[PDB]
Symmetry: C2
Subunit: 122 residues, 2 copies
């Protein structure tokens, strides 16, 4: 679920997701169309593609099992859907940590008016 | 996609989603666990259950066809998945409009610490 993903993001970026990623660019958090504004937004777009490939559960609300082993994120589910969602979140959180250096506050609160361009493809 | 849902929300509530719903309670926008804080949050929880029933597309990025006929929201897709996502958004936007009167700014920016309680069931 997104709060768990938010826990992963906190560990990898030091940022609270509800004040940042939840409203960043055209794809992070609330969005879904337009062009990914930068590397951070591209992580979110790739994660949405990833969610598109899990199977029968709702990624937003699927509550999975995970742990930090040292700093590494380890998904613990056996259940295929919970596990697949956890793997998408893990990968996306590492991607966000990798690109936190170029995080631009100017992309915060983007809305439909900034995200008109044709959507990205998976 | 969420920006289109945001367009529906704007028409029904007069509020810009990225500044409000996108970070409201335990279920609206960024969330997915805990207890729905109020009627508004319950709309979002029911919408997540609705998304759980559409079929093979990613609701966040599925770009559907809709129009306002007077004030009514009319989904125009033939495609089953796009249509089902549009119907979930339409229903959720009407629900949010119906409950805008009890919208509480105090539920804005809720995070995992406020949404610990056991999750709601569909």
């Amino acid at each position: 679920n997104l709060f768990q993903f938010g826990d992963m993001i906190l560990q990898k970026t030091g940022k609270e997701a509800v004040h940042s990623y939840a409203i960043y660019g055209c794809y992070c958090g609330w969005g879904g169309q337009g062009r990914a504004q930068d590397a951070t937004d591209r992580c979110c777009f790739a994660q949405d593609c990833c969610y598109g490939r899990v199977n029968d559960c709702n990624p937003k609300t699927a509550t999975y099992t995970y742990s930090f082993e040292n700093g590494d994120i380890v998904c613990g589910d056996n259940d295929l859907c919970l596990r697949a969602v956890c793997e998408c979140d893990r990968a996306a959180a590492i991607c966000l940590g990798e690109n936190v250096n170029t995080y631009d506050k100017n992309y915060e609160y983007y809305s439909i008016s900034h995200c008109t361009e044709e959507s990205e493809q998976c």
